[PDB]
RNA sequence: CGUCGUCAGCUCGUGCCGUGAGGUGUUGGGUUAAGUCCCGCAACGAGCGCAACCCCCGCCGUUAGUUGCCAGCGGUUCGG
């Protein structure tokens with residue numbers, strides 16, 4: 390499922406803005422840029438993909454977490470492929486530790502999923518009506534993938550654990566496996582199942598994400614091949 | 621009942637921070653008569669307030685035509 394010629398997308402970056410705790414996954418500092426060693430990645434993917442495949446094999450649920458620009462749309466696709474919950478735009482504080490309370494915003498969502506599912510009564514003030522069509526969109530803008538998350542997840546798969554320290558901190562507090570792909574600017578000790586590598590190259594973000602999702606399909610029966618590897 | 625003050629404010633529930641008082645939310649950018657609304661955000665909602673629903677005034681319609689009114693023909697002591 391893995392590769393060895395994945396070294397043709399990323400092998401690391403981020404020039405001397407590093408976290409010293411990451412040095413045990415760094416091979417050399419060449420063009421001003423810290424270069425990640427992938428023999429450290431290959432062993433680690435063996436751990437992570439051992440965890441991911443074994444997790445879906447028993448009915449798990451991985452909350453995929455991506456927020457930044459270079460990983461915005463790709464995390465939407467890959468989580469929808471495996472039918473997995475994603476958080477796309479903003480990570481709402483408490484989403485995990487205050488789950489039974491933010492989930493109270495998807496019930497309001499399903500409400501406007503029924504209301505604007507013709508008709509209940511649309512014959513109630515259009516102002517009072519189009520008031521809601523904006524509240525509808527907003528809920529979809531932030532709860533589009535979290536809605537399928539009906540219960541506190543079994544693990545989370547984040548794109549950037551520094552950029553997403555809030556989500557990590559909550560999951561760590563709930564004894565939730567924190568699995569993540571991370572480059573030279575993050576804390577290995579905070580990640581339960583690590584994937585050392587670039588998290589800014591879309592050419593690399595999609596790679597370790599798209600063919601990680603592929604592994605999730607084969608663990609819940611049957612395979613599919615093509616996912617969006619847009620150029 | 622007066623008053624501050626019809627001033628835009630005062631708080632709660634869960635989560636987060638803090639040894640603790642307490643903080644966050646309610647701060648920030650913009651907008652409003654307004655914590656009014658928008659965008660942002662370790663917060664997510666909620667309540668009391670603000671607004672609204674209520675009464676008078678301003679235009680039009682329906683429904684009614686005496687004790688009210690008189691547009692147009694008839695009288696008319698000349699007062700519908």
Ligand SMILES: [Mg+2]
Pocket residue numbers: 549552574589
């Ligand atoms: Mg970064």
Ligand SMILES: [Mg+2]
Pocket residue numbers: none
């Ligand atoms: Mg005051």
Ligand SMILES: [Mg+2]
Pocket residue numbers: none
């Ligand atoms: Mg509290």
Ligand SMILES: [Mg+2]
Pocket residue numbers: 638
């Ligand atoms: Mg202090």
Ligand SMILES: [Mg+2]
Pocket residue numbers: none
């Ligand atoms: Mg505490």
Ligand SMILES: [Mg+2]
Pocket residue numbers: none
């Ligand atoms: Mg408090």
Ligand SMILES: [Mg+2]
Pocket residue numbers: 646
């Ligand atoms: Mg206050």
Ligand SMILES: [Mg+2]
Pocket residue numbers: 646
């Ligand atoms: Mg406060």
Ligand SMILES: [Mg+2]
Pocket residue numbers: 646
């Ligand atoms: Mg205040």
Ligand SMILES: [Mg+2]
Pocket residue numbers: 647
């Ligand atoms: Mg303050």
Ligand SMILES: [Mg+2]
Pocket residue numbers: 626653654
């Ligand atoms: Mg006022």
Ligand SMILES: [Mg+2]
Pocket residue numbers: none
């Ligand atoms: Mg706010």
